[PDB]
Amino acid sequence: RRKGPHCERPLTQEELLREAKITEELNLRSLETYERLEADKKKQVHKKRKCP
Amino acid sequence: TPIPLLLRGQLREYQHIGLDWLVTMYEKKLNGILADEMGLGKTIQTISLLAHLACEKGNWGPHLIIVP
Numbered sequence: 001r002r003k004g005p006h007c008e009r010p011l012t013q014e015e016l017l018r019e020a021k022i023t024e025e026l027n028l029r030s031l032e033t034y035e036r037l038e039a040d041k042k043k044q045v046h047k048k049r050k051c052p
Numbered sequence: 053t054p055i056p057l058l059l060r061g062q063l064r065e066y067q068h069i070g071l072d073w074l075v076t077m078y079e080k081k082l083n084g085i086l087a088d089e090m091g092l093g094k095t096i097q098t099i100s101l102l103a104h105l106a107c108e109k110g111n112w113g114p115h116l117i118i119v120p
């Protein structure tokens with residue numbers, strides 16, 4: 001009785017939707033440019049000093 | 053079969069002819085070795101085959117690339 005088929009939302013791909021998804025992937029390439037550029041590693045300072 | 057699809061920075065001669073050969077193999081339902089010697093952009097030829105098949109043979113399927 002406790003069935004869970006998940007046949008709902010039977011989504012399918014189409015040619016008009018193809019170019020839209022290509023468009024968001026072109027934007028994803030543009031975003032990839034932010035991965036193609038680079039910044040620095042942020043190194044760290046020395047340990048605290050004793051004083052007895 | 054010698055035609056670039058939604059791709060950028062287009063091929064040079066042997067790469068375009070290789071794209072043509074690859075989609076010719078696909079159309080005849082064949083499987084192939086692109087045994088091109090190194091530097092002929094066989095990666096780029098394969099990417100162009102990906103694009104060509106995606107736009108011209110229905111839609112793209114999940115091509116799996118297993119590499120070193």
Ligand SMILES: Nc1ncnc2c1ncn2[C@@H]1O[C@H](COP(=O)(O)OP(=O)(O)O)[C@@H](O)[C@H]1O
Nearest residue numbers: 061062063064067089090091092093094095096
């Ligand atoms: N047709 C091409 N046009 C522009 N650049 C290319 C082309 N083919 C290869 N390159 C550049 O030269 C390098 C060599 O390509 P590569 O993928 O190493 O070919 P292969 O793997 O077949 O040796 C790549 O990093 C690529 O950026």
Ligand code: BEF
Nearest residue numbers: 089090091094095
């Ligand atoms: F032709 Be290669 F080195 F992929």
